[PDB]
Design a protein around this nucleic acid. Structure first.
Ligand SMILES: [Zn+2]
Lengths: 119, 92, 270, 154, 60, 97, 58, 58
DNA sequence: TCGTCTGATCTCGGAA
DNA sequence: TTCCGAGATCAGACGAGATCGGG
RNA sequence: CCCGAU
């Protein structure tokens, strides 16, 4: 968003303006996202309650807000999806992000996310 | 601990039941290779190299392998307990 | 000029003063001491007036399982109690574990060791076998051992004085070491309840003229000498809200032109 | 470089059903061979057994008496299934010289069945939707003729 | 531009309900001497102005 | 949690925290407060929901935490509630993710 | 929180003869004089600082 | 605003100057893109507060 | 949108 | 045993600049 | 109600 383009008065920071090189995303199907998630390594509903806990190697994959299993190695998952997206097998817009404070990786195929390109 | 099980399997000859999540590949003797540095790779059928390494914490519960023989006409018999799970992933 | 540690100083301070609310955010009572020349003596006064929960001063507490009972135990860090200048002892804790609303009101709580460990076994009723002991392990390291319970914490400042972030004024004014003749608040209600109305007039003069010179914004005192003297002339401090106008004015349309036009017109027809 | 080979062992794995226990991790508890009174279903196993309680712990006594039904005392189980797609997991028995793959059937978790408090409340009373499916099983729940026994088999 | 904003109202239409001058320049205006400007006229002590400015030339 | 099918209390802590250090202070909070009234039963603990919801609540627990899907296999629903509790014991509204 | 092997319903201590009889099916482990230990070490209030006049001039 | 980092150009947990709001260039030599953003962020707190203060002091 | 003040029921506690 | 009175704990309220301009 | 002025 533009930092300096805003009204003043009632809407001093409540009516923003999009910047130049942005792109709002549209929705898509979640088929190949799940299909690559379950190959790359995830498992849920068979794991003992204890697993998903303070143990470091339990990053739990979340897609669009629904848990899709847990991965022992977060890096392989974030990196492999990212190489796959760059290769073009997964839609360019989908984003894999990782929060290490709470071990949840976050595959978002939401549609409506503010996006932008980088080199 | 990824290749340790194989070395521990090497340390005691006792047969160990293992849990394997193969990738979702339909059928279109397999070979397992342990790379130097512990990077176990299963060079499976079709000569594809699938990397399988580590898994969820296991043994934190009792997981038991049982062969249901339809005991009304057979027997349900526990054959083994469980060991660390193993997950197989395709590689790129 | 309204248009033009932490203490609130802006318009949310002046709006907080004019309302004269009973409870304000960040109330601060400053206090001068008798012997303002050494940090250790004012240390001793500081621990005397700021609250310290049983939890803050102790080592590894737990229940301990002995045949036919389960008594809790507290190891009570004694290096600390001498480090933080404060005067607790296991007798003083035992009086403070008592009369502390946790129903331990009898002499069930004991005093073991070398005045270094207290023990309370078990209550009488309300699932007394275990469920009060798992209840007891939570409320026991949150009873105030000593000090004014209301006061959040007291911070020294250098001659020496100490400012508190609390509200219980006369319990602070009466402690040993603080010359209670020279101690002020910034909560104009707790000066009105404790120090009379005339000291509550002088804080409304001061704490407006303190927050007005803090923001630049010079102002005559004769304006604040009028606003304070209106605000406290009918008995008690009447803050200028919707509610304080009812206790200040008799005429209806002056109240009815202000807020609550519906109720003020019907009630004055009743 | 252990190059151990994996046999795609065709030894019938249709019999193989993994059983899980999110109940017994405290002291390497093994379920123990002696207990019988075995009852098992093919779909939604609901393993019902003779997990008779010890008497080394001191009698338990009146509260056991207070239990109402205990039949020594069955500590049965209802199988929480997790069989959505059930071929993603198919490992078997592995030496350091040989490796035998076998594709299992649906894994089933086995938490403890109560039904003592369930039946207990009913007793006081005396004083969902298509829950069982269209065919009411009429069979899977009937199947418990069970024999857990010890045999070295592959 | 000041041609769109120049405005004066001598005596014109009054609103049908409250018989005060209307709001807007499109409706020949009358600008609200608001209650904040009432206090300014209070603080000057001008008493006979406020009777003139809020009874005589608004709602007589 | 007992209404959701996981009836035992060992499972619930195993969900919330196996490493205990602060998730032990989940213990005397609620699973004791659950146990303080003798109410260990799955069907009976739908019943307390069956009163306040203004056997009949197997369905009306689908209008609670919706998008975690259930086919009357509530195991996926439990972890998502357990992770919601997991955050609190470990504890930005304007941030553009 | 010590759990029950057999139902898993959490620790209850009956003060009769030192057992752990749970609200469910009795599994009372009558722990002998083994001494229970739960010392959850708290925090210790740590001294003070004089809030000095080293800097206020700027 | 991000995790342990003011803008994703700096490193995580950087407490460095010119990574948490210091601008080195004056207005003659012109601000740089991170520097221009932090000056905008500190500039809007002027504009935001006059909207809300007059909503209260009125 | 809380934020405020109000005023309306409960409960552990002392006096006769 | 009694209980009469009082500190504790929810629920509901009715507030939140000023003007001017046009569709 | 939006927008816009200050
Ligand atoms: Zn039990």
């Amino acid at each position: 968003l533009c930092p300096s383009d805003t009204p003043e008065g009632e809407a001093c920071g409540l009516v923003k303006n999009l910047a130049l090189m942005t792109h709002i995303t549209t929705d898509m199907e979640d088929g190949p996202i799940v299909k690559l998630a379950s190959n790359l390594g995830v498992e849920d509903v068979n794991l003992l309650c204890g697993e998903e806990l303070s143990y470091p190697n339990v990053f739990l994959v979340f897609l669009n807000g629904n848990i899709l299993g847990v991965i022992r190695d977060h890096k392989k998952l974030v990196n492999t999806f990212r190489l796959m997206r760059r290769a073009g097998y997964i839609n360019e817009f989908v984003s894999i992000s990782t929060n290490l404070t709470d071990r949840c990786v976050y595959i978002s195929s939401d549609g409506g996310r503010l996006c932008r390109p980088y080199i | 601990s990824v290749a340790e099980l194989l070395r521990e399997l090497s340390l005691t000859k006792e047969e160990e039941l293992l849990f394997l999540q193969l990738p979702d590949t339909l059928p279109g003797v397999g070979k397992l290779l342990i790379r130097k540095s512990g990077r176990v790779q299963l060079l499976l059928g079709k000569v594809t190299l699938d990397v399988t390494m580590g898994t969820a914490c296991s043994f934190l519960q009792e997981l038991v392998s049982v062969g249901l023989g339809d005991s009304r006409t057979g027997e349900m018999t526990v054959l083994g307990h469980v060991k660390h799970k193993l997950v197989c992933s395709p590689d790129f | 000029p309204g248009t033009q540690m932490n203490i609130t100083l802006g318009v949310p301070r002046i709006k907080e003063i004019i309302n004269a609310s009973k409870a304000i955010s960040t109330p601060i009572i400053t206090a001068q001491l008798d012997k303002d020349d050494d940090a250790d003596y004012a240390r001793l006064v500081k621990g005397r007036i700021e609250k310290t929960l049983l939890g803050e001063i102790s080592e590894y507490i737990e229940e301990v399982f002995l045949p036919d009972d389960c008594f809790i135990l507290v190891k009570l860090s004694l290096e600390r109690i001498r480090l933080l200048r404060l005067e607790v002892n296991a007798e003083t804790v035992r009086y403070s574990i008592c009369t502390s609303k946790l129903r331990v009101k009898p002499g069930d709580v004991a005093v073991h060791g070398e005045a270094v460990v207290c023990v309370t076994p078990r209550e009488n009723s309300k699932s007394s076998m275990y469920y009060v002991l798992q209840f007891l392990k939570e409320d026991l390291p949150k009873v105030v051992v000593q000090g004014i319970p209301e006061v959040s914490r007291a911070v020294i400042h250098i001659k020496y004085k100490l400012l508190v972030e609390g509200d219980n004024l006369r319990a602070v004014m009466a402690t040993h070491g603080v010359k209670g003749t020279r101690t002020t608040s910034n909560n104009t209600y707790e000066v009105e309840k404790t120090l009379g109305i005339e000291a509550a007039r002088t804080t409304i003069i001061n704490e407006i003229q303190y927050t007005m010179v803090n923001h630049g914004m010079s102002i005559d005192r004769r304006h604040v000498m009028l606003l304070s003297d209106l605000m406290t002339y009918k008995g008690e401090v009447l803050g200028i809200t919707r509610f304080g106008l009812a206790k200040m004015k008799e005429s209806v349309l002056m109240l009815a032109s202000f807020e609550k036009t519906a109720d003020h017109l019907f009630d004055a027809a009743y | 470089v252990q190059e151990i080979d994996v046999y795609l062992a065709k030894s019938l794995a249709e019999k193989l059903y993994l059983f899980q226990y999110p109940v017994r991790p405290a002291s390497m508890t093994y379920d123990d061979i002696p207990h019988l009174s075995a009852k098992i279903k093919p779909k939604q196993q609901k393993v019902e057994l003779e997990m008779a309680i010890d008497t080394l712990n001191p009698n338990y006594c009146r509260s056991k008496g207070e239990q109402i039904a205990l039949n020594m005392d069955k500590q049965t189980f209802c199988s929480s299934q997790t069989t959505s797609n059930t071929s993603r997991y198919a490992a078997a028995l592995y030496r350091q010289g040989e490796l035998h793959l076998t594709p299992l059937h649906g894994i089933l978790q086995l938490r403890p069945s109560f039904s003592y408090l369930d039946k207990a409340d009913a007793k006081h009373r005396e004083r969902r939707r298509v829950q069982s499916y269209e065919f009411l099983q009429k069979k899977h729940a009937e199947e418990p003729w069970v024999h857990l026994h010890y045999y070295g088999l592959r | 531009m000041v041609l769109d904003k120049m405005h004066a109202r001598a005596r014109g239409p009054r609103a049908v309900l409250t018989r005060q001058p209307t709001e807007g320049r499109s409706r020949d205006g009358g600008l609200r001497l608001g209650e904040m400007e009432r206090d300014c006229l209070i603080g000057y002590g001008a008493s006979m102005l406020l009777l003139e400015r809020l009874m005589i030339s608004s709602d007589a | 949690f007992k209404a959701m099918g996981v009836e035992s209390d060992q499972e619930i802590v195993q969900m919330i925290g196996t490493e205990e250090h602060v998730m032990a202070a989940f213990g005397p909070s609620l699973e004791e407060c659950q146990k303080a009234q003798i109410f260990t039963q799955m069907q009976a603990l739908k019943y307390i929901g069956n009163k306040v919801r203004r056997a009949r609540e197997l369905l009306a627990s689908t209008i609670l935490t919706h998008v975690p899907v259930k086919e009357f296999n509530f195991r996926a629903k439990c972890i998502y509630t357990a992770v919601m509790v997991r955050r609190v014991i470990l504890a930005d509204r304007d941030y553009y993710g | 929180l010590l759990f029950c092997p057999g139902c898993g319903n959490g620790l209850i201590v009956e003060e009769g003869q030192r057992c752990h009889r749970f609200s469910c099916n009795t599994c009372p482990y009558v722990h002998n004089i083994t001494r229970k230990v739960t010392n959850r070490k708290y925090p210790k209030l740590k001294e003070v600082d004089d809030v000095l006049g080293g800097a206020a001039a700027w | 605003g991000f995790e342990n980092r003011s803008l994703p150009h700096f490193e995580k947990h950087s407490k460095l100057p010119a990574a948490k709001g210091f601008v080195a260039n004056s207005f003659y030599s012109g601000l740089t893109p991170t520097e221009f953003f932090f000056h905008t962020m500190a500039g809007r707190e002027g504009l935001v507060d006059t909207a809300v203060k007059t909503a209260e002091t009125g």
